[PDB]
Amino acid sequence: NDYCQHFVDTGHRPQNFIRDVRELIRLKDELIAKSNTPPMYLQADIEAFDIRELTPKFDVILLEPPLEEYYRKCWTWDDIMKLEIDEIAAPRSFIFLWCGSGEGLDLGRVCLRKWGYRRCEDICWIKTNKNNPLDPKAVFQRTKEHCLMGIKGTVDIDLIITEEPEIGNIEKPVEIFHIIEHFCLGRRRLHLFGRDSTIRPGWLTVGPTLTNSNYNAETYASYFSAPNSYLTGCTEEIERL
């Protein structure tokens, strides 16, 4: 049975027919939650903000620039490529870059190389249209977004399947945080262009639409001072007193 033909016949995307969209990966979930730092967050216009003010250097950076394609203040790949991401990434670190579905698949790769990463995974967010069975260069109907994973220095599948959000909803699937956190990459986690709705324990969220800030560089750094400097985020607390 040919779900591509079926999509042409009915408008139901082939991904609508994927089924099921260990057991100890829950104790790991619990360890992540225990070692998570308090959520921290800062309202900042990133185009005007000096990124170096954000210390210390991060083990993982989630970068979610509001692309024009997300809408039926937008950032172009021109603006994104000029971010000084390498000035705040730790020498060993990871980046997760939401690239959309168009030119970003190429320009996001340029950005990764520009900032000193190599791409190690291509995570595809496949959007189903079960509830509801156009770019001029497009050859096909675009039904997915890519989040590229980059590594610099020295359990999960690479797919996320959810229903296509309502038009004008720019949110990305929260599943991406689960994939990232399950890697156990360290505890200094930055989300650029996050929002009030994405603030999360274990994460420093920075973005222009935050309504409130609680970020203090010295407070933030105190979460990773010895004995806690090198934890993965997947291990027990270190006993004190």
Binding site: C4, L105, D156, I157, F183
Partner: protein, 198 residues
């Protein structure tokens, strides 16, 4: 000429200028990530002669996600879409840092194709994995709906890949099977003894 055609050959050494122009090219190269091609051999493939206006479908994995984009651009294409095939078992369940549930196929455009049916299919294929390295048959139907009745060429195909409207090239095909008279004629001129060397 509608029925399947194919040439057993070393794609490095074949003079592809005898094949004419094609509306769609598809390649599934043996990337060096066995019979592979070095990066430089891939770059020097004479893809530019195969089309004037049309689409290239280029399977990529690992670091060929980047190297394939390079080849695509060097050969004169812009990448305008990216198909993924989600690999399922027969019950529609999905099969370094992450386990891989999908294969990628870059879609490049050259020139300004006119009269293609853009937007008929979407960029996700959901299909059962079969033999190793075997691409899903859905791609041919997608390509047929996109460009019905036009000439197409597949590089590094295998015998199971032969299709009407397609000429298939690969070194595990059974001999040479050409029916298009334009092609037959140019093949005889270029290869009067039927041999493809150097």
């Amino acid at each position: 000429l509608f029925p399947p055609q194919w040439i057993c050959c070393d794609i490095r050494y074949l003079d592809v200028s005898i094949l004419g122009k094609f509306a769609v090219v598809m390649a599934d190269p043996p990337w060096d990530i066995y019979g592979t091609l070095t990066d430089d051999e891939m770059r020097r493939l004479n893809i530019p002669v195969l089309q004037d206006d049309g689409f290239l479908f280029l399977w990529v994995t690992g670091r060929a996600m980047e190297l394939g984009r390079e080849c695509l651009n060097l050969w004169g294409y812009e990448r305008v879409d990216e198909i993924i095939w989600v690999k399922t078992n027969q019950l529609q369940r999905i099969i370094h840092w992450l386990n891989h549930g999908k294969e990628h196929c870059l879609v490049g455009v050259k020139g300004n194709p006119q009269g293609f049916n853009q937007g008929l299919d979407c960029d996700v294929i959901v299909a059962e994995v079969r033999s190793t390295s075997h691409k899903p048959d859905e791609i041919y139907g997608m390509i047929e709906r996109l460009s019905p009745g036009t000439r197409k060429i597949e590089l590094f195909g295998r015998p199971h890949n032969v299709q009407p409207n397609w000429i298939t090239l690969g070194n595990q095909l059974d001999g040479i099977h050409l029916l298009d008279p334009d092609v037959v004629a140019r093949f005889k001129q270029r290869y009067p003894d039927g041999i493809i060397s150097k």
